[PDB]
Design a protein around this motif. Sequence first.
Motif, PDB file in Angstrom:
ATOM      1  N   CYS A  37       3.849   8.534   6.266  1.00 26.12           N
ATOM      2  CA  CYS A  37       2.527   7.953   6.432  1.00 26.12           C
ATOM      3  C   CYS A  37       2.679   6.640   7.166  1.00 26.12           C
ATOM      4  O   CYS A  37       1.814   6.264   7.961  1.00 26.12           O
ATOM      5  CB  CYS A  37       1.855   7.683   5.106  1.00 26.12           C
ATOM      6  SG  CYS A  37       2.551   6.224   4.409  1.00 26.12           S
ATOM      7  N   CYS A  95       9.753   2.216   1.748  1.00 24.01           N
ATOM      8  CA  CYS A  95       9.940   3.415   0.939  1.00 24.01           C
ATOM      9  C   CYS A  95      11.410   3.775   0.816  1.00 24.01           C
ATOM     10  O   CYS A  95      11.985   3.724  -0.278  1.00 24.01           O
ATOM     11  CB  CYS A  95       9.151   4.583   1.519  1.00 24.01           C
ATOM     12  SG  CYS A  95       7.414   4.515   1.153  1.00 24.01           S
ATOM     13  N   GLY A 122       8.588   9.575   4.012  1.00 27.96           N
ATOM     14  CA  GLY A 122       8.059   8.370   4.614  1.00 27.96           C
ATOM     15  C   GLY A 122       7.063   8.547   5.738  1.00 27.96           C
ATOM     16  O   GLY A 122       6.888   7.641   6.554  1.00 27.96           O
ATOM     17  N   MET A 135       2.713   3.416   5.964  1.00 24.59           N
ATOM     18  CA  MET A 135       1.786   2.362   5.616  1.00 24.59           C
ATOM     19  C   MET A 135       2.464   1.115   5.081  1.00 24.59           C
ATOM     20  O   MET A 135       2.078   0.015   5.486  1.00 24.59           O
ATOM     21  CB  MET A 135       0.759   2.847   4.590  1.00 24.59           C
ATOM     22  CG  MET A 135      -0.342   1.849   4.375  1.00 24.59           C
ATOM     23  SD  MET A 135      -1.200   1.579   5.924  1.00 24.59           S
ATOM     24  CE  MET A 135      -1.866  -0.048   5.639  1.00 24.59           C
ATOM     25  N   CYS A 136       3.456   1.237   4.204  1.00 26.76           N
ATOM     26  CA  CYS A 136       4.209   0.073   3.759  1.00 26.76           C
ATOM     27  C   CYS A 136       5.057  -0.385   4.939  1.00 26.76           C
ATOM     28  O   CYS A 136       5.930   0.338   5.412  1.00 26.76           O
ATOM     29  CB  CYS A 136       5.044   0.349   2.504  1.00 26.76           C
ATOM     30  SG  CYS A 136       6.551   1.365   2.567  1.00 26.76           S
ATOM     31  N   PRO A 196       0.824  -1.218   0.000  1.00 28.36           N
ATOM     32  CA  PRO A 196       0.000   0.000   0.000  1.00 28.36           C
ATOM     33  C   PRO A 196       0.852   1.260   0.000  1.00 28.36           C
ATOM     34  O   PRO A 196       1.885   1.324   0.664  1.00 28.36           O
ATOM     35  CB  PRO A 196      -0.812  -0.127   1.292  1.00 28.36           C
ATOM     36  CG  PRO A 196      -0.817  -1.584   1.580  1.00 28.36           C
ATOM     37  CD  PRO A 196       0.521  -2.076   1.152  1.00 28.36           C
ATOM     38  N   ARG A 197       0.413   2.259  -0.754  1.00 23.83           N
ATOM     39  CA  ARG A 197       1.223   3.433  -1.040  1.00 23.83           C
ATOM     40  C   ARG A 197       0.496   4.698  -0.632  1.00 23.83           C
ATOM     41  O   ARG A 197      -0.482   5.083  -1.276  1.00 23.83           O
ATOM     42  CB  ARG A 197       1.549   3.497  -2.524  1.00 23.83           C
ATOM     43  CG  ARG A 197       2.377   2.355  -2.975  1.00 23.83           C
ATOM     44  CD  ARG A 197       2.544   2.382  -4.464  1.00 23.83           C
ATOM     45  NE  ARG A 197       3.275   1.204  -4.906  1.00 23.83           N
ATOM     46  CZ  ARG A 197       2.700   0.046  -5.222  1.00 23.83           C
ATOM     47  NH1 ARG A 197       1.383  -0.086  -5.152  1.00 23.83           N
ATOM     48  NH2 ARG A 197       3.444  -0.984  -5.607  1.00 23.83           N
ATOM     49  N   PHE A 198       0.978   5.353   0.421  1.00 24.20           N
ATOM     50  CA  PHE A 198       0.475   6.674   0.776  1.00 24.20           C
ATOM     51  C   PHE A 198       1.528   7.768   0.683  1.00 24.20           C
ATOM     52  O   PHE A 198       1.325   8.731  -0.060  1.00 24.20           O
ATOM     53  CB  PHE A 198      -0.146   6.662   2.166  1.00 24.20           C
ATOM     54  CG  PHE A 198      -1.559   6.247   2.190  1.00 24.20           C
ATOM     55  CD1 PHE A 198      -2.285   6.143   1.026  1.00 24.20           C
ATOM     56  CD2 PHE A 198      -2.189   6.027   3.388  1.00 24.20           C
ATOM     57  CE1 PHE A 198      -3.596   5.790   1.055  1.00 24.20           C
ATOM     58  CE2 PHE A 198      -3.506   5.674   3.425  1.00 24.20           C
ATOM     59  CZ  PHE A 198      -4.208   5.560   2.258  1.00 24.20           C
ATOM     60  N   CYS A 199       2.655   7.664   1.375  1.00 22.55           N
ATOM     61  CA  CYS A 199       3.607   8.763   1.365  1.00 22.55           C
ATOM     62  C   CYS A 199       4.620   8.642   0.249  1.00 22.55           C
ATOM     63  O   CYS A 199       5.757   9.095   0.403  1.00 22.55           O
ATOM     64  CB  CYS A 199       4.331   8.873   2.708  1.00 22.55           C
ATOM     65  N   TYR A 200       4.243   8.048  -0.870  1.00 26.34           N
ATOM     66  CA  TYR A 200       5.194   7.710  -1.916  1.00 26.34           C
ATOM     67  C   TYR A 200       4.595   8.069  -3.261  1.00 26.34           C
ATOM     68  O   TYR A 200       3.390   7.921  -3.464  1.00 26.34           O
ATOM     69  CB  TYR A 200       5.548   6.229  -1.872  1.00 26.34           C
ATOM     70  CG  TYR A 200       6.476   5.836  -2.975  1.00 26.34           C
ATOM     71  CD1 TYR A 200       7.809   6.200  -2.934  1.00 26.34           C
ATOM     72  CD2 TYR A 200       6.019   5.120  -4.072  1.00 26.34           C
ATOM     73  CE1 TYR A 200       8.667   5.854  -3.945  1.00 26.34           C
ATOM     74  CE2 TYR A 200       6.869   4.770  -5.091  1.00 26.34           C
ATOM     75  CZ  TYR A 200       8.194   5.140  -5.020  1.00 26.34           C
ATOM     76  OH  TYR A 200       9.057   4.794  -6.029  1.00 26.34           O
TER      77      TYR A 200
HETATM   78  S1  FES Z   1       4.271   3.484   1.469  1.00 28.82           S
HETATM   79 FE1  FES Z   1       5.138   5.496   1.504  1.00 28.82          FE
HETATM   80  S2  FES Z   1       6.180   5.100   3.389  1.00 28.82           S
HETATM   81 FE2  FES Z   1       5.226   3.135   3.410  1.00 28.82          FE
END
Ligand code: FES
Lengths: 52, 230
Positions: free
Chosen positions: B47, B64, B45, B49-50, B33-37
């Motif tokens: 968020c 990330c 980095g 989430m990964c 899962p990708r939020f801060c990327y």
């Molecule tokens: S997915 Fe962007 S930091 Fe984990």
Amino acid sequence: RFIQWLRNWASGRDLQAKLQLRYQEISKRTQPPPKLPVGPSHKLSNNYYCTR
Amino acid sequence: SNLIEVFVDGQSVMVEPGTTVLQACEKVGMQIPRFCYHERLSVAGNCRMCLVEIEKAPKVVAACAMPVMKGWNILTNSEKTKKAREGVMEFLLANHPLDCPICDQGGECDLQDQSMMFGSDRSRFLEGKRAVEDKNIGPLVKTIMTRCIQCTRCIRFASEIAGVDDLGTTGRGNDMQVGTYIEKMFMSELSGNIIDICPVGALTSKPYAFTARPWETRKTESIDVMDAVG
Ligand code: FES
Ligand code: SF4
Ligand code: SF4
């Protein structure tokens, strides 16, 4: 009465199992407000994904 | 030559020495899962989430921003990784209001296609939900800054490709905000192209605002002709 027992000589005698429930002793209404129990592991601190 | 076989879920693949765990796991046909990327942006980095549980380690790392050493076993599905992807995406689904009857990204938000597959079942918070105020910037960017899960993705775009240095981070801890401190408008070239980058429906289009939901359209590809570059 005399029209009564002619129904009781013909095809046995029942007198109680009428074809209508329109008389008394049919359930009319129900009062209370319902509330539903929420049982099957809905709670917290052990009920938890990757187990289910 | 110039490679390391890393057993992604116990299966060899040869990457360049100095790539990312994300691009390694995406090469073998998987999605973390990708939020801060973003690929077309820089890398932060914040968020978190990964989170994959790497083998022969008690800790958990994020895919990330770290290189890949000599060939690990990147254990994607574990009995601890799912204790992390459930974990982080329970907090940020609390301090958030009950929209999506009316949130205009209501068919494609990434709190809505992650939250069925990953994550938990119910909530235990059970009161709170801070509520910040919004503002206006230009007559193009319909602006609800309440939702704003602070993934720092629109923020770097001001230092990225669109070189207008306009946005920032105002605040500390729970209370920080994203918008411009003064009421300076933000409009230049590419200035309407942020509302794709915002991964939740906190940013949206002003003329499009209240029309129709995105499960009724018919996507047909074409080309625009209003410039020479196509
Ligand atoms: S997915 Fe962007 S930091 Fe984990
Ligand atoms: S607009 Fe919202 S989702 Fe996009 S980077 Fe900014 S805070 Fe994150
Ligand atoms: S942007 Fe995401 S969190 Fe917000 S209303 Fe839409 S699906 Fe829900």
